[PDB]
Design a protein around this ligand. Structure first.
Ligand SMILES: [As]
Ligand SMILES: [Zn+2]
Ligand SMILES: [Zn+2]
Ligand SMILES: [Zn+2]
Ligand SMILES: [Zn+2]
Lengths: 29, 29, 29
């Protein structure tokens, strides 16, 4: 159960970095 | 404490989902 | 361990708030 949450937040960190990069692209057209 | 962090992480997941939705609508719509 | 995960999830919340504001910027030009 603790391990599951840790993996979850790590997945979220991954997804978030992906979104940040995608938004940087879209910002620039 | 456990409940609080689990709820926070889950909210973050929902929010990330909502933002990627909005990003897709901006990019394509 | 617990404190580091709380710190991480907090940093993720901050980053997601920044990204929401940025997406809203782009929705408006
Ligand atoms: As988290
Ligand atoms: Zn930039
Ligand atoms: Zn630029
Ligand atoms: Zn808006
Ligand atoms: Zn507006």
């Amino acid at each position: 159960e603790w391990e599951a949450l840790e993996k979850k937040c790590a997945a979220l960190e991954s997804k978030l970095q992906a979104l940040e990069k995608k938004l940087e692209a879209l910002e620039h057209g």
